[PDB]
Design a protein around this ligand. Sequence first.
Ligand SMILES: CC[C@@H](C)c1cc2c(n(-c3ccc(=O)n(CC(=O)O)c3)c1=O)CN(C(=O)OCCOC)CC2
Length: 326
Amino acid sequence: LACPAERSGHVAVSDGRHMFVWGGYKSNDFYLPREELWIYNMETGRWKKINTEGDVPPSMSGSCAVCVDRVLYLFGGHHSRGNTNKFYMLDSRSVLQWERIDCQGIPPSSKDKLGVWVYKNKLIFFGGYGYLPEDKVLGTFEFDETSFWNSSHPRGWNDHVHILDTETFTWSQPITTGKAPSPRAAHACATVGNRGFVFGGRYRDARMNDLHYLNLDTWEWNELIPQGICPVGRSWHSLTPVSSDHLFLFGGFTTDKQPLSDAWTYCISKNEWIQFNHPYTEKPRLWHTACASDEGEVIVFGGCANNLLVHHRAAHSNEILIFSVQ
Ligand SMILES: CC[C@@H](C)c1cc2c(n(-c3ccc(=O)n(CC(=O)O)c3)c1=O)CN(C(=O)OCCOC)CC2
């Protein structure tokens, strides 16, 4: 049967019925073919591979993508020659053609492993890992000292918020109030209404357990302190909105390098986490993707079952894990 190869660090976006999968890498390391676009039909469980043309982005891991009215947008990532800040569009409504957009304004620094919130005409990007910004811009950047000893170009984490306005394809940075979360990468973002949630991620020697939201109307940051038991700190997890009041969390990697198979729901109205029982306790995943379907399910694809930092033993997956959340 038509089935995409195993991979981690790919993107997966959806319209609630079809899930589009692109990029990523695997071992036996190499990037998956840049021209392939895999489409999973969430209702039938079948895959279809299509070959794209146009301004095909380079093969990358850690890119950040969205699907808005069946138009896919892709930002950033890491290819064979490093990080990028290029922005692409792929209209999937109707051979599919990638379009690299010449954006106006100052783009974000080249980076990967970030997150995005969609709010009306705006794509709002947050955080990531990559090069030192070419100029001192709004926000903070912290170097990863380990990147000076094993590479020609040092990298670090940022807490930057950038808006790509789809009305004009212009980059800008909002002036925020409140305490932004620390710089981080491999955090997870989820949007509900005008609230852009962000949970966890890596910063310095920690994989974090903090939860915040940015008000996408006022640009005010808020820290959420749920009472009672909270999930363990992690990076490379997924956080997916499943209703107007619930975010679904799955997998990830702890500070002490444990791959995770726990799942939880964060109830926004109660400001509480509820652990979610599921049949995949023996299928931990990190750097997988998750997409919510119109039928209340969360579809998880790819990612790695163990510590992918030991490249020769990494267990990249091509499994679809289906969570019946709502
Ligand atoms: C994109 C290539 C990928 C396989 C990759 C490889 C390596 C690293 N990151 C990174 C870089 C930044 C970052 O925030 N995270 C997320 C996270 O750590 O949760 C992973 C990669 O993303 C970071 N490293 C690392 O953590 O080494 C262990 C500690 O060393 C004292 C060193 C090898």
